[PDB]
């Protein structure tokens, strides 16, 4: 999108745009988020429905 | 072994085999529906259970 910004305002907004904290989320990430010793425990059945 | 499957509760193998149409034999005391309809057999209903 076009924008009119002072160079300082542009610097701040461009830093916010270029350095966002969001990462892609997939089922592999969620699976690895579970503790690795609970994923390997046979007493717990974990599924991605 | 359906008994082992129910005890452990892990359906990964059975799900993989059913989704991939891999021939298998589910072994365990099971109740069954007796059907005398020829049209049901032609319709291949037994494979939909």
């Amino acid at each position: 999108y076009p924008s009119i910004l002072h160079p300082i305002d542009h610097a701040f907004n461009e830093y916010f745009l270029q350095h966002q904290l969001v990462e892609p989320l997939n089922n592999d990430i969620i699976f690895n988020y579970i503790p690795e010793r609970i994923r390997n425990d046979v007493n717990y059945i974990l599924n991605m429905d | 072994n359906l008994e082992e499957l129910m005890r452990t509760g892990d359906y990964a193998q059975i799900t993989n085999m059913l989704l991939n149409n891999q021939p298998v034999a589910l072994v365990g005391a099971l109740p069954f529906i007796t059907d005398s309809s020829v049209i049901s057999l032609v319709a291949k209903l037994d494979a939909t259970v």
Binding site: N43, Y44, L46 | -
Partner: protein
């Protein structure tokens, strides 16, 4: 002084996405019957039964 050339920028971002906080809400977790629960050595936790 306001210079249009120096102030006109193109801001680039993503069209849309959804941010999720509770990753573990995506995991369907069940547990075996307590009678059948086993310890790290693959034997039942309580064997006196």
């Amino acid at each position: 002084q306001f210079d249009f050339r120096a102030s006109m920028h193109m801001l680039t971002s993503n069209l849309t996405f959804t941010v999720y906080s509770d990753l573990l809400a995506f995991v369907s977790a069940d547990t075996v019957e307590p009678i059948n629960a086993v310890a790290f050595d693959n034997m039942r936790i309580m064997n006196e039964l």
